[PDB]
Design a binder for this molecule. Structure first.
Ligand SMILES: O=C1Nc2ccccc2/C1=C1/Nc2ccccc2/C1=N\OCC[C@@H](O)CO
Lengths: 310, 127
């Protein structure tokens, strides 16, 4: 993994020199790769596994990325390779992903801004709008792609200073519509696969309570986005303690004496609706963010230069 | 900390030539991929040329191919750009930075240095 630095990887006509490690997240590593013939810099994601279930999940994720590529807020796909169990040095099946190189993780940019104080309303609007714009591109697909793991940790800052969605590991095209025809077996197997693919504090009421007949679909991403907008505005996550009782009953509160992010209050309340059917669509969210941006004369597609320059 | 200082820029006639110079200190130069970038009013930053740490490869943006030559002196920690057959499209603030570019000739690193002004004009003296 660490030893993969200094390598010259071939991906089609490209001959990428692996320069330096950027991230480590379990079975995957992210490196800064540079073409030796052009000088163009990329991101190389490496994954080592011999597990068939992982190989199949990598295929799905890469297929979603190929489909979602080209949106200004989805990380741009360049190429990928799947080297065999025998054909690799490690003896494991090797998975290589080549994308555009981003400046860094959003989380590491916000961590540097807390010293300077709370983020400006315009900064929040751009971060949030660009994120929703990525989710909108997903829900717009035929069939809709539900992220299921939206959080600031999965958001990168591009070269220009625009938000980029990079991970699609938990994404699915499968919606559930629980009924008076579902067995306890069905309910638990459904609950099992969704717990593995979500951040506990970002878990939705419809997945905590499988005895509500709440559909489990694209509205999951709306709840997660409501959490993000709360987190960007105020210090903490609206359900950081990860209590199922608070999440399932929608028990959170917008700081009583805030006069900075009032413009976003209505949206937070409208997105964090317990029943998913009573929650806004991504189009309604985008439209409301567009109006806020218009009444302020901010282009919300603009670089978040407030983050970049530090 | 990192320090980059450019020189060589000036007012030169179209078809003319210049030699830009860049001095580096504050990092291990001998191991850094170095680039020439330019800021153009009403455009922004664009990557121009780049060179491997050991000079085994030199890269150029299509618009300067065959006209520009990037070189380096790892002993003196210097970076050069031989410009020739200059066009008005070559007018801008030239800076030298570490690393390459991303996508449409967009530098990885935004210049912190002063830069040197290249003005491709016939003017007698600076305006
Ligand atoms: O392009 C990138 N520049 C960086 C600078 C610092 C840390 C990471 C990255 C990065 C990444 N580019 C890509 C492209 C595809 C998948 C992941 C990914 C990256 N980093 O991922 C690290 C965080 C991620 O694990 C959150 O889910």
């Amino acid at each position: 993994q660490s030893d993969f630095v200094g390598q010259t990887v071939e991906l089609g006509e490209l001959r990428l020199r692996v320069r330096r490690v950027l991230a480590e997240g379990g079975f995957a590593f992210v490196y800064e790769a540079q073409d030796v013939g052009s000088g163009r810099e990329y991101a190389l994601k490496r994954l080592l596994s011999n597990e068939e279930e992982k190989n199949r999940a990598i295929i799905q994720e890469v297929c979603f990325m190929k489909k979602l590529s080209g949106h200004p807020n989805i990380v741009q796909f360049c190429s990928a390779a799947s080297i065999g169990k025998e054909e690799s040095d490690t003896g494991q099946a090797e998975f290589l992903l080549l994308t555009e190189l981003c400046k860094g993780q959003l989380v590491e940019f916000l961590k540097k801004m807390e010293s300077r104080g709370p983020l400006s309303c315009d900064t929040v609007l751009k971060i949030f709008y660009q994120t929703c714009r990525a989710v909108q591109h997903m829900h717009r697909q035929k069939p809709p792609i539900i992220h299921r793991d939206l959080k600031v940790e999965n958001l990168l800052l591009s070269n220009q200073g625009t938000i980029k969605l990079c991970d699609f590991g938990s994404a699915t095209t499968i919606s559930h519509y629980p009924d008076y025809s579902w067995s306890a077996q069905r309910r638990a197997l459904v609950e099992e696969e969704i717990t593995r693919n979500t951040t506990p504090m970002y878990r939705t009421p419809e997945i905590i309570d499988l005895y509500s007949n709440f559909p489990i679909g694209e509205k999951q991403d709306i709840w997660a986005l409501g959490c993000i907008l709360y987190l960007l505005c105020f210090r903490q996550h609206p359900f950081e303690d990860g209590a199922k009782l608070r999440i399932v009953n929608g028990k959170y509160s917008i700081p009583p004496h805030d006069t900075q992010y009032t413009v976003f209050h209505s949206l937070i309340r409208a997105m964090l609706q317990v029943n998913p059917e009573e929650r806004l669509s991504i189009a309604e969210v985008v439209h409301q963010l567009q109006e806020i941006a218009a009444a302020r004369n901010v282009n919300p597609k603009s670089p978040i230069t407030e983050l970049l320059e530090q | 900390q990192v320090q980059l200082q450019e020189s060589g820029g000036g007012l030169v006639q179209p078809g003319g030539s210049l030699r830009l110079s860049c001095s580096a200190s504050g990092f291990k130069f001998n191991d850094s991929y170095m680039s020439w970038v330019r800021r153009v009013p009403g455009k922004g930053l664009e990557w121009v040329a780049g060179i491997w740490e050991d000079s085994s490869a030199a890269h150029y943006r299509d618009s300067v191919k065959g006209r520009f030559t990037i070189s380096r002196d790892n002993a003196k920690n210097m970076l050069y750009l031989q410009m020739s057959s200059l066009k008005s499209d070559d007018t801008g603030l030239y800076y030298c930075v570490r690393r390459g570019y991303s996508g449409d000739y967009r530098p990885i690193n935004n210049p912190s240095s002063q830069g040197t002004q290249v003005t491709v004009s016939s003017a007698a003296a600076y305006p």
